[PDB]
Design a protein around this ligand. Structure first.
Ligand code: MG
Ligand code: ZN
Length: 366
């Protein structure tokens, strides 16, 4: 996180953004060349959630849902760096390198930028899982072409449908998807796997079968958080060693502002990109006791990659005295810079600004 000493001017913010990109380009999440020979295998499950920010959860009265107190680690100031689904998945799939501009999401990146490819080199079977068919917005195509994720889509046949999207496509029940994930990872002939799971029940336009109005966001979120929390309980009981990372793509923009009305995401505003990220470890000999460890520093995907690197050997799952402080200290910080095509949002001296299509930086409503 480099200096914002100069007074805010459009030129100074342009320069700061350039310096941010240049500093980010030097950042890698470095993986070991091999695992220790006594490594303990485990499953990594990355749950990538559409349309979920702190602001949304507060608007829906779900800040105190039991899910949020169930995590071992929680990032209080994680930035999604974008307000669109495809870009958010690409950024997460490229978690192992510094944050790039929007444009550079659609240019190749170094192979060691690709989190799941880094894990594959260490022996983790890759799984791609979705609670939908990925057709809307060309999402699955972007996951494959720019996120580098070529794995077969995990079988979705016979999954119960809980919502229909705006396009009439199915939204599958997360409980059913996740319970199938348990079986598929058991049957994949590998003791370790890493799964990218994208789920969007909170998407705009989703409606119950037979009902034309889109379903209440709060109701869908309550059910989704109930299901995720109950899955955590099923997972604890399985005895299986699992690291779960819950990473929203971006908020649903429930609460608008003076510049951008509710539901619109053209501008990746702070309220849209400030998303809760949680990590929970299952099957530990010494499970984390007490309330989540809260990481307050500004964070983004690079911190997820570096956290995964820290536990690659799986010893966290068998240690008697886990050094949670060490595990959660010194993770990489990332300034809250967010981009879509031709819109960039930054915090400069703790105030947000927006720059659209190379116009001036405009103070963003606070
Ligand atoms: Mg397996
Ligand atoms: Zn999304």
């Amino acid at each position: 996180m480099p200096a914002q000493t100069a007074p805010p001017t459009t030129a100074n913010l342009n320069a700061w953004l350039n310096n941010f990109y240049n500093a980010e380009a030097k950042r890698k999440s470095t993986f070991p060349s091999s695992l220790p020979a006594d490594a303990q295998p485990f499953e990594l499950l990355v749950i990538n959630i559409c349309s979920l920010s702190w602001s949304d959860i507060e608007a829906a009265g779900l800040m105190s849902h039991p899910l949020w107190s169930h995590f071992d680690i929680e990032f209080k100031n994680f930035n999604s760096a974008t307000s669109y689904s495809g870009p958010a998945a690409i950024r997460l799939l490229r978690a192992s390198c510094g944050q790039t501009s929007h444009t550079n999401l659609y240019q190749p990146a170094n192979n060691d930028c690709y989190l799941f490819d880094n894990l594959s080199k260490l022996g983790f079977t890759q799984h791609l899982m979705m609670g939908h068919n990925g057709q809307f917005g060309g999402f699955l195509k972007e996951v494959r072409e720019n996120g580098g994720m070529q794995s077969e889509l995990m079988d979705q046949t016979n999954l119960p449908v809980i919502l229909l999207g705006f396009d009439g496509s199915p939204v599958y029940d997360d409980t059913a998807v996740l319970n199938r994930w348990l079986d598929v990872t058991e049957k994949d002939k590998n003791s370790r796997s890493a799964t990218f799971y994208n789920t969007l029940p909170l998407h705009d336009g989703n409606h119950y079968p037979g009902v034309s109005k889109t379903a209440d966001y709060k109701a869908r979120a309550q059910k989704f958080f109930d299901e995720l929390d109950a899955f955590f309980t099923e997972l604890e009981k399985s005895g299986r060693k699992v690291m779960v990372v819950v990473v929203p793509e971006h908020g649903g923009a429930l609460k608008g502002d003076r510049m951008q009305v509710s539901g619109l995401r053209d501008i990746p505003s702070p309220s849209i990109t400030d998303v809760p990220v949680g990590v929970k470890f299952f099957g530990m000999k010494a499970p984390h006791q007490g309330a989540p460890i809260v990481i307050e520093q500004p964070s983004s995907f690079l911190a997820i990659s570096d956290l995964v690197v820290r536990v690659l050997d799986g010893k966290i799952f068998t240690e008697d005295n886990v050094d949670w402080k060490k595990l959660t200290s010194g993770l990489p910080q990332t300034a809250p810079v967010s981009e879509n095509s031709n819109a960039v949002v930054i915090q400069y001296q703790d105030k947000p600004y927006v720059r659209l299509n190379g116009g001036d930086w405009v103070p963003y409503p606070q």
